């Protein structure tokens, strides 16, 4: 068993709606889930998760639509990944504040 | 062959590591993700530049995929070094579509 790396990629330092992209990589076996939180609260809509692909290990990406003003206002976003009975949380926010 | 019915330019966006986005043993690495969207016809080329120089390794461009005039999307992922990122190197996703070039540039600076 290999648990995923969980990384989130964010809009540029010098500005943009846009997306947060959560990637879970280097995992096996296949079953995995991805969800999102915003300021610690469940996100109910506005994200899509792509088909899992082979990189044997696998990769999946999920994309959350976000607004620029919420990003600049230092809202904290979390990608939640579940794999093999573990839960992983990766938090991100705007660097330029 | 079946002809494409429309001509639409790509939108190009790049996604970057957050400030705590570098991992693994030193020297640490991360990634940039380029996405080109909303284009047709399907053929497209993605290239990466670092300070204007073509990057010839360390990236993977996924197959172009479908997203009413059908449009397409492509994702490319470049491995980057923390040292280069913090040295303020400028990275460019260069997208060529139907003879036109569209760039998106990023760096670590605020």
Coordinates of N, CA and C in Angstrom, one line a residue:
Chain A
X1 N 0.9 -1.2 0.0 CA 0.0 0.0 0.0 C 0.9 1.2 0.0
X2 N 0.5 2.2 -0.8 CA 1.1 3.5 -0.8 C 0.1 4.6 -0.6
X3 N 0.2 5.4 0.4 CA -0.8 6.5 0.6 C -0.4 7.6 -0.2
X4 N -1.4 8.5 -0.6 CA -1.1 9.5 -1.6 C -0.3 10.6 -1.0
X5 N 0.5 11.2 -1.9 CA 0.9 12.6 -1.7 C -0.3 13.5 -2.0
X6 N -0.6 14.5 -1.2 CA -1.7 15.4 -1.4 C -1.1 16.8 -1.6
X7 N -1.3 17.4 -2.7 CA -0.8 18.8 -3.0 C -1.9 19.6 -3.6
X8 N -2.0 20.8 -3.3 CA -2.9 21.8 -3.9 C -2.2 22.9 -4.6
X9 N -2.6 23.2 -5.8 CA -2.1 24.2 -6.7 C -3.1 25.3 -6.8
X10 N -2.6 26.6 -6.8 CA -3.4 27.7 -6.5 C -3.2 28.8 -7.6
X11 N -4.1 29.8 -7.7 CA -3.8 30.8 -8.7 C -2.5 31.6 -8.4
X12 N -2.0 32.2 -9.4 CA -0.7 32.9 -9.3 C -0.6 34.0 -8.3
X13 N 0.7 34.2 -7.8 CA 1.0 35.3 -6.8 C 0.5 36.6 -7.3
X14 N 0.6 36.9 -8.6 CA 0.2 38.2 -9.2 C -1.2 38.1 -9.8
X15 N -2.1 37.3 -9.3 CA -3.5 37.4 -9.5 C -4.1 36.5 -10.5
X16 N -5.4 36.5 -10.6 CA -6.2 35.6 -11.5 C -5.9 36.1 -12.9
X17 N -13.1 34.7 -11.1 CA -13.0 33.3 -10.6 C -11.9 32.5 -11.2
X18 N -11.5 31.5 -10.5 CA -10.4 30.6 -10.9 C -10.7 29.3 -10.1
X19 N -9.6 28.6 -9.9 CA -9.6 27.2 -9.4 C -8.6 27.0 -8.4
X20 N -8.8 26.0 -7.5 CA -7.8 25.3 -6.8 C -7.8 23.9 -7.3
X21 N -6.6 23.3 -7.5 CA -6.5 22.0 -8.0 C -5.8 21.1 -7.0
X22 N -6.5 20.2 -6.5 CA -6.0 19.2 -5.5 C -5.6 18.0 -6.3
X23 N -4.3 17.5 -6.1 CA -3.8 16.3 -6.7 C -3.4 15.3 -5.7
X24 N -3.9 14.1 -5.8 CA -3.5 13.0 -5.0 C -2.7 12.1 -5.9
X25 N -1.5 11.8 -5.5 CA -0.5 11.1 -6.4 C 0.2 10.0 -5.7
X26 N 0.7 9.1 -6.4 CA 1.6 8.0 -5.9 C 0.9 7.1 -5.0
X27 N -0.4 6.8 -5.2 CA -1.1 5.9 -4.3 C -1.5 4.6 -4.9
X28 N -1.7 3.6 -4.1 CA -2.2 2.3 -4.5 C -2.7 1.7 -3.2
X29 N -3.8 0.9 -3.2 CA -4.7 0.7 -4.3 C -5.6 1.8 -4.6
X30 N -6.5 1.6 -5.6 CA -7.2 2.6 -6.2 C -8.3 3.4 -5.5
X31 N -9.0 2.7 -4.6 CA -10.2 3.5 -4.1 C -9.7 4.7 -3.4
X32 N -10.2 5.8 -3.7 CA -9.8 7.1 -3.0 C -11.0 8.1 -3.2
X33 N -11.1 9.0 -2.2 CA -12.1 10.1 -2.3 C -11.4 11.4 -2.1
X34 N -12.0 12.4 -2.7 CA -11.6 13.8 -2.6 C -12.8 14.7 -2.3
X35 N -12.7 15.6 -1.3 CA -13.7 16.6 -1.0 C -13.0 17.9 -0.6
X36 N -13.8 18.9 -0.3 CA -13.2 20.2 0.0 C -13.9 20.8 1.2
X37 N -13.2 21.7 1.9 CA -13.7 22.5 3.0 C -13.3 23.9 2.7
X38 N -14.0 24.9 3.2 CA -13.7 26.3 3.1 C -14.0 26.9 4.5
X39 N -13.0 27.5 5.1 CA -13.0 27.9 6.5 C -13.4 26.9 7.4
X40 N -13.0 25.6 7.2 CA -13.4 24.5 8.1 C -14.7 23.9 7.9
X41 N -15.5 24.3 6.9 CA -16.8 23.9 6.7 C -17.0 23.2 5.3
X42 N -17.8 22.2 5.2 CA -18.0 21.4 4.1 C -18.4 22.2 2.9
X43 N -17.8 22.0 1.8 CA -18.2 22.5 0.5 C -19.2 21.6 -0.2
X44 N -20.3 22.1 -0.5 CA -21.4 21.2 -1.0 C -21.6 21.2 -2.5
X45 N -20.9 22.1 -3.2 CA -21.1 22.3 -4.6 C -19.8 23.1 -5.1
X46 N -19.7 23.1 -6.4 CA -18.7 23.9 -7.1 C -17.3 23.2 -7.3
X47 N -17.2 21.9 -7.2 CA -16.0 21.2 -7.5 C -16.3 20.0 -8.4
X48 N -15.3 19.6 -9.1 CA -15.3 18.4 -10.0 C -14.1 17.6 -9.8
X49 N -14.2 16.3 -9.8 CA -13.1 15.4 -9.7 C -12.9 14.6 -11.0
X50 N -11.7 14.6 -11.5 CA -11.4 13.9 -12.8 C -11.2 12.4 -12.6
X51 N -11.3 11.7 -13.7 CA -11.0 10.2 -13.6 C -9.6 9.9 -13.1
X52 N -9.5 8.9 -12.3 CA -8.3 8.4 -11.8 C -7.5 7.8 -12.9
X53 N -6.2 8.1 -13.0 CA -5.3 7.6 -14.1 C -4.1 6.9 -13.5
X54 N -3.4 6.2 -14.3 CA -2.2 5.5 -13.9 C -1.1 6.4 -14.2
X55 N -0.1 6.5 -13.3 CA 1.0 7.3 -13.4 C 2.2 6.6 -14.2
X56 N 2.4 -0.4 -9.5 CA 1.5 0.6 -10.2 C 0.9 1.5 -9.3
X57 N 0.9 2.8 -9.6 CA 0.3 3.8 -8.7 C -0.6 4.7 -9.6
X58 N -1.4 5.5 -8.9 CA -2.4 6.2 -9.5 C -2.4 7.7 -9.2
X59 N -3.1 8.5 -9.9 CA -3.3 9.9 -9.7 C -4.7 10.3 -9.9
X60 N -5.2 11.2 -9.1 CA -6.5 11.9 -9.2 C -6.4 13.3 -9.0
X61 N -7.1 14.1 -9.7 CA -7.2 15.5 -9.5 C -8.7 16.0 -9.3
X62 N -8.9 16.9 -8.4 CA -10.1 17.6 -8.1 C -9.9 19.1 -8.2
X63 N -10.9 19.8 -8.7 CA -10.9 21.2 -9.0 C -12.0 21.9 -8.3
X64 N -11.7 22.9 -7.4 CA -12.7 23.7 -6.8 C -12.7 25.1 -7.4
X65 N -13.9 25.6 -7.8 CA -14.0 26.9 -8.3 C -14.0 27.9 -7.1
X66 N -13.2 28.9 -7.2 CA -13.1 29.9 -6.1 C -13.2 31.3 -6.7
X67 N -13.5 32.3 -5.8 CA -13.6 33.7 -6.3 C -12.3 34.4 -5.8
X68 N -11.9 35.4 -6.6 CA -10.7 36.1 -6.3 C -10.8 36.9 -5.0
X69 N -12.0 37.6 -4.7 CA -12.1 38.3 -3.5 C -12.0 37.4 -2.3
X70 N -12.6 36.2 -2.4 CA -12.5 35.3 -1.2 C -11.1 34.9 -1.0
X71 N -10.4 34.6 -2.1 CA -9.0 34.2 -2.0 C -8.1 35.3 -1.4
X72 N -8.3 36.6 -1.9 CA -7.5 37.7 -1.3 C -7.8 38.1 0.1
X73 N -9.1 37.7 0.5 CA -9.5 37.9 1.8 C -9.1 36.8 2.8
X74 N -8.2 35.9 2.3 CA -7.6 35.0 3.2 C -8.6 33.9 3.7
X75 N -9.6 33.6 2.9 CA -10.3 32.4 3.2 C -9.4 31.2 3.1
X76 N -9.6 30.2 4.0 CA -8.7 29.0 4.0 C -9.4 27.9 3.4
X77 N -8.8 27.2 2.4 CA -9.4 26.1 1.7 C -8.7 24.8 2.0
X78 N -9.4 23.7 2.1 CA -8.8 22.5 2.5 C -9.2 21.4 1.5
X79 N -8.3 20.7 1.0 CA -8.6 19.5 0.2 C -8.5 18.3 1.2
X80 N -9.6 17.5 1.3 CA -9.6 16.3 2.1 C -9.6 15.1 1.2
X81 N -8.6 14.2 1.5 CA -8.4 13.0 0.7 C -8.5 11.9 1.7
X82 N -9.3 10.8 1.3 CA -9.4 9.6 2.1 C -8.9 8.4 1.3
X83 N -8.0 7.6 1.9 CA -7.4 6.5 1.3 C -7.2 5.5 2.3
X84 N -7.6 4.2 2.1 CA -7.3 3.1 3.0 C -7.5 3.4 4.5
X85 N -8.6 4.0 4.8 CA -8.8 4.3 6.2 C -8.1 5.4 6.9
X86 N -7.4 6.2 6.2 CA -6.7 7.4 6.6 C -7.4 8.6 5.9
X87 N -7.4 9.7 6.6 CA -7.9 11.0 6.1 C -6.7 12.0 6.1
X88 N -6.5 12.7 5.0 CA -5.5 13.7 4.8 C -6.1 15.0 4.5
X89 N -5.6 16.0 5.2 CA -6.1 17.4 5.0 C -4.9 18.3 4.5
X90 N -5.1 19.0 3.4 CA -4.1 19.9 2.9 C -4.8 21.3 2.8
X91 N -4.3 22.2 3.6 CA -4.8 23.6 3.6 C -4.0 24.5 2.8
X92 N -4.7 25.5 2.2 CA -4.1 26.5 1.4 C -4.8 27.8 1.6
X93 N -4.1 28.9 1.3 CA -4.6 30.3 1.3 C -3.7 31.1 0.4
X94 N -4.1 32.3 0.2 CA -3.3 33.4 -0.4 C -2.0 33.8 0.3
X95 N -0.9 33.7 -0.5 CA 0.5 34.0 0.1 C 0.6 35.5 0.2
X96 N 0.2 36.2 -0.9 CA 0.4 37.6 -0.9 C -0.5 38.4 0.1
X97 N -1.4 37.8 0.8 CA -1.5 38.2 2.3 C -1.2 37.0 3.2
Chain B
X1 N -12.0 12.8 -43.9 CA -11.9 13.5 -42.6 C -13.1 14.4 -42.3
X2 N -13.3 14.6 -41.0 CA -14.4 15.5 -40.6 C -13.9 16.8 -40.2
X3 N -14.4 17.9 -40.8 CA -13.8 19.2 -40.5 C -14.3 19.8 -39.2
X4 N -13.5 20.5 -38.5 CA -14.0 21.2 -37.3 C -14.7 22.5 -37.8
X5 N -15.8 22.8 -37.0 CA -16.7 23.8 -37.6 C -16.4 25.3 -37.2
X6 N -15.4 25.4 -36.3 CA -15.3 26.6 -35.5 C -13.8 26.8 -35.2
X7 N -13.5 28.1 -34.8 CA -12.2 28.5 -34.4 C -12.3 29.3 -33.2
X8 N -11.7 28.8 -32.1 CA -11.8 29.4 -30.8 C -10.4 29.3 -30.2
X9 N -9.9 30.5 -29.7 CA -8.6 30.5 -29.0 C -8.6 29.9 -27.6
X10 N -7.5 29.4 -27.2 CA -7.5 28.9 -25.8 C -7.4 30.0 -24.8
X11 N -8.0 29.8 -23.6 CA -7.7 30.5 -22.4 C -6.6 29.7 -21.7
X12 N -5.6 30.4 -21.2 CA -4.4 29.7 -20.6 C -4.3 30.2 -19.2
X13 N -4.3 29.2 -18.3 CA -4.1 29.5 -16.9 C -3.1 28.6 -16.3
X14 N -2.3 29.1 -15.3 CA -1.3 28.4 -14.6 C -1.5 28.4 -13.1
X15 N -1.4 27.3 -12.5 CA -1.6 27.1 -11.1 C -0.3 26.7 -10.5
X16 N 0.0 27.3 -9.3 CA 1.3 27.4 -8.7 C 1.3 26.8 -7.3
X17 N 2.5 26.5 -6.7 CA 2.5 26.0 -5.4 C 2.1 27.2 -4.4
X18 N 1.4 26.9 -3.3 CA 1.2 27.9 -2.3 C 2.6 28.1 -1.6
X19 N 2.6 29.0 -0.6 CA 4.0 29.3 -0.1 C 4.6 28.1 0.6
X20 N 3.8 27.2 1.2 CA 4.3 26.0 1.8 C 4.2 24.8 0.9
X21 N 4.3 25.0 -0.4 CA 4.1 23.9 -1.4 C 5.3 23.1 -1.8
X22 N 6.4 23.1 -1.1 CA 7.6 22.4 -1.5 C 7.9 21.3 -0.5
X23 N 8.2 20.2 -1.1 CA 8.2 18.9 -0.3 C 9.3 18.0 -0.7
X24 N 9.5 17.0 0.1 CA 10.4 15.9 -0.1 C 11.7 16.4 0.5
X25 N 12.7 15.5 0.4 CA 14.0 15.9 0.8 C 14.6 17.0 0.0
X26 N 15.5 17.8 0.6 CA 16.1 18.9 -0.2 C 17.0 18.2 -1.2
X27 N 17.3 18.9 -2.3 CA 16.6 20.1 -2.8 C 15.1 19.9 -3.2
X28 N 14.2 20.6 -2.6 CA 12.8 20.3 -2.7 C 12.2 20.7 -4.0
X29 N 11.1 20.0 -4.4 CA 10.5 20.2 -5.7 C 9.0 20.5 -5.5
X30 N 8.4 21.1 -6.5 CA 6.9 21.2 -6.6 C 6.6 21.2 -8.1
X31 N 5.4 21.7 -8.4 CA 4.9 21.6 -9.8 C 4.2 22.9 -10.1
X32 N 4.2 23.2 -11.4 CA 3.3 24.1 -12.0 C 2.3 23.4 -12.9
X33 N 1.1 23.8 -13.0 CA 0.0 23.2 -13.8 C -0.5 24.2 -14.8
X34 N -0.3 23.9 -16.0 CA -0.9 24.8 -17.1 C -2.2 24.1 -17.6
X35 N -3.2 24.9 -17.8 CA -4.4 24.4 -18.4 C -4.8 25.3 -19.5
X36 N -5.0 24.8 -20.7 CA -5.6 25.5 -21.8 C -7.0 25.0 -22.0
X37 N -7.9 25.9 -22.1 CA -9.3 25.6 -22.1 C -10.0 26.4 -23.2
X38 N -11.2 25.9 -23.6 CA -12.1 26.6 -24.4 C -11.7 26.8 -25.8
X39 N -10.8 25.9 -26.3 CA -10.3 26.0 -27.7 C -10.9 25.0 -28.7
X40 N -10.9 25.3 -29.9 CA -11.2 24.4 -31.0 C -10.6 24.9 -32.3
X41 N -10.1 24.1 -33.2 CA -10.0 22.7 -33.2 C -9.0 22.1 -32.1
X42 N -9.0 20.8 -32.0 CA -8.3 20.1 -31.0 C -6.8 20.2 -31.0
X43 N -6.1 20.1 -32.2 CA -4.6 20.2 -32.1 C -4.1 21.4 -31.4
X44 N -3.2 21.2 -30.5 CA -2.6 22.3 -29.7 C -1.2 21.8 -29.3
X45 N -0.3 22.7 -29.0 CA 1.0 22.5 -28.5 C 1.2 23.2 -27.3
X46 N 1.8 22.6 -26.2 CA 2.2 23.2 -25.0 C 3.6 23.1 -24.8
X47 N 4.3 24.2 -24.4 CA 5.7 24.3 -24.1 C 5.9 25.0 -22.8
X48 N 6.9 24.7 -22.1 CA 7.3 25.4 -20.9 C 8.6 26.2 -21.1
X49 N 8.7 27.4 -20.6 CA 10.0 28.1 -20.6 C 10.3 28.5 -19.2
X50 N 11.6 28.6 -18.8 CA 12.1 29.1 -17.6 C 13.0 30.2 -17.9
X51 N 12.7 31.4 -17.5 CA 13.5 32.6 -17.8 C 13.7 32.6 -19.3
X52 N 12.7 32.3 -20.1 CA 12.8 32.4 -21.6 C 13.4 31.3 -22.3
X53 N 14.0 30.3 -21.6 CA 14.6 29.2 -22.2 C 13.7 28.0 -22.2
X54 N 13.7 27.3 -23.3 CA 12.8 26.1 -23.4 C 13.2 25.0 -22.4
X55 N 12.2 24.5 -21.7 CA 12.3 23.4 -20.8 C 12.1 22.1 -21.6
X56 N 13.1 21.2 -21.6 CA 13.1 20.0 -22.4 C 12.9 18.7 -21.6
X57 N 12.7 18.8 -20.3 CA 12.5 17.6 -19.5 C 11.7 18.0 -18.3
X58 N 11.2 17.0 -17.5 CA 10.6 17.3 -16.3 C 9.2 17.8 -16.4
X59 N 8.5 17.6 -17.5 CA 7.1 17.9 -17.7 C 6.3 16.8 -18.3
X60 N 5.0 16.7 -18.1 CA 4.2 15.8 -18.7 C 2.9 16.5 -19.2
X61 N 2.6 16.4 -20.5 CA 1.4 17.0 -21.0 C 0.4 15.9 -21.3
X62 N -0.7 15.9 -20.7 CA -1.8 14.9 -20.8 C -2.4 15.0 -22.2
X63 N -3.1 13.9 -22.6 CA -3.9 14.0 -23.8 C -4.9 15.1 -23.8
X64 N -5.1 15.7 -25.0 CA -6.1 16.7 -25.1 C -7.5 16.0 -24.9
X65 N -8.4 16.6 -24.3 CA -9.7 16.0 -24.0 C -10.9 17.0 -24.3
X66 N -12.0 16.4 -24.5 CA -13.2 17.2 -24.7 C -13.6 17.9 -23.5
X67 N -14.1 19.2 -23.5 CA -14.8 19.8 -22.4 C -16.2 19.5 -22.3
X68 N -24.2 23.3 -30.2 CA -23.1 23.7 -29.2 C -21.7 23.3 -29.8
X69 N -20.8 24.3 -30.0 CA -19.5 24.0 -30.7 C -18.6 23.3 -29.7
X70 N -18.1 22.1 -30.0 CA -17.3 21.4 -29.1 C -16.0 22.0 -28.9
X71 N -15.6 22.1 -27.6 CA -14.3 22.7 -27.3 C -13.5 21.7 -26.5
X72 N -12.2 22.0 -26.3 CA -11.3 21.0 -25.8 C -10.4 21.7 -24.6
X73 N -9.7 20.8 -23.9 CA -8.9 21.2 -22.8 C -7.6 20.4 -22.8
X74 N -6.5 21.0 -22.3 CA -5.3 20.2 -22.1 C -4.6 20.7 -20.8
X75 N -4.0 19.7 -20.1 CA -3.3 20.0 -18.9 C -1.8 19.6 -19.1
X76 N -0.9 20.4 -18.7 CA 0.5 20.1 -18.6 C 1.1 20.4 -17.3
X77 N 2.0 19.6 -16.7 CA 2.5 19.7 -15.4 C 4.0 19.7 -15.5
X78 N 4.6 20.7 -15.0 CA 6.1 20.9 -15.0 C 6.6 20.8 -13.5
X79 N 7.6 19.9 -13.3 CA 8.3 19.9 -12.1 C 9.3 21.0 -12.0
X80 N 9.2 21.7 -10.8 CA 10.1 22.9 -10.6 C 10.9 22.7 -9.3
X81 N 12.0 23.4 -9.2 CA 12.8 23.4 -8.0 C 12.5 24.6 -7.1
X82 N 12.5 24.3 -5.8 CA 12.3 25.4 -4.9 C 13.3 26.5 -5.0
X83 N 14.6 26.1 -5.3 CA 15.6 27.1 -5.4 C 15.4 28.0 -6.6
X84 N 15.0 27.5 -7.7 CA 14.7 28.3 -8.9 C 13.5 29.2 -8.6
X85 N 12.4 28.6 -7.9 CA 11.2 29.4 -7.6 C 11.6 30.6 -6.7
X86 N 12.4 30.3 -5.7 CA 12.8 31.4 -4.7 C 13.8 32.3 -5.3
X87 N 14.5 31.9 -6.4 CA 15.4 32.9 -7.1 C 14.6 33.7 -8.1
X88 N 13.3 33.6 -8.1 CA 12.5 34.5 -8.8 C 12.5 34.2 -10.3
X89 N 12.8 33.0 -10.7 CA 12.7 32.6 -12.1 C 11.3 32.8 -12.6
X90 N 11.1 33.2 -13.8 CA 9.8 33.4 -14.4 C 9.5 32.2 -15.2
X91 N 8.4 31.5 -15.1 CA 8.0 30.4 -15.8 C 6.9 30.7 -16.8
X92 N 6.9 30.2 -17.9 CA 6.0 30.5 -19.0 C 5.4 29.2 -19.5
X93 N 4.1 29.2 -19.5 CA 3.3 28.2 -20.3 C 3.0 28.8 -21.6
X94 N 3.6 28.3 -22.7 CA 3.4 28.8 -24.0 C 2.5 27.8 -24.8
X95 N 1.4 28.3 -25.3 CA 0.4 27.5 -25.9 C 0.3 28.0 -27.4
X96 N 0.5 27.1 -28.3 CA 0.4 27.4 -29.7 C -0.9 26.7 -30.2
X97 N -1.8 27.5 -30.8 CA -3.0 26.9 -31.4 C -3.3 27.6 -32.7
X98 N -3.3 26.8 -33.8 CA -3.8 27.3 -35.1 C -2.9 28.5 -35.5
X99 N -1.6 28.4 -35.2 CA -0.6 29.4 -35.7 C -0.5 30.6 -34.7
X100 N -1.3 30.7 -33.7 CA -1.2 31.8 -32.7 C -0.7 31.3 -31.4
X101 N 0.1 32.2 -30.7 CA 0.7 31.8 -29.5 C 0.1 32.6 -28.3
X102 N -0.1 31.9 -27.2 CA -0.7 32.5 -26.0 C 0.2 32.1 -24.9
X103 N 0.7 33.1 -24.1 CA 1.6 32.8 -23.0 C 0.9 33.1 -21.6
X104 N 1.2 32.4 -20.6 CA 0.9 32.7 -19.3 C 2.2 32.6 -18.5
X105 N 2.6 33.7 -17.7 CA 3.8 33.8 -17.0 C 3.6 33.8 -15.5
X106 N 4.3 33.1 -14.7 CA 4.2 33.2 -13.3 C 5.6 33.3 -12.6
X107 N 5.7 33.7 -11.4 CA 6.8 33.7 -10.5 C 6.4 33.7 -9.1
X108 N 7.4 33.5 -8.2 CA 7.1 33.5 -6.8 C 6.8 34.9 -6.2
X109 N 7.1 35.9 -6.9 CA 7.0 37.3 -6.3 C 5.6 37.7 -6.2
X110 N 5.3 38.5 -5.1 CA 4.0 39.2 -4.9 C 4.1 40.6 -5.4

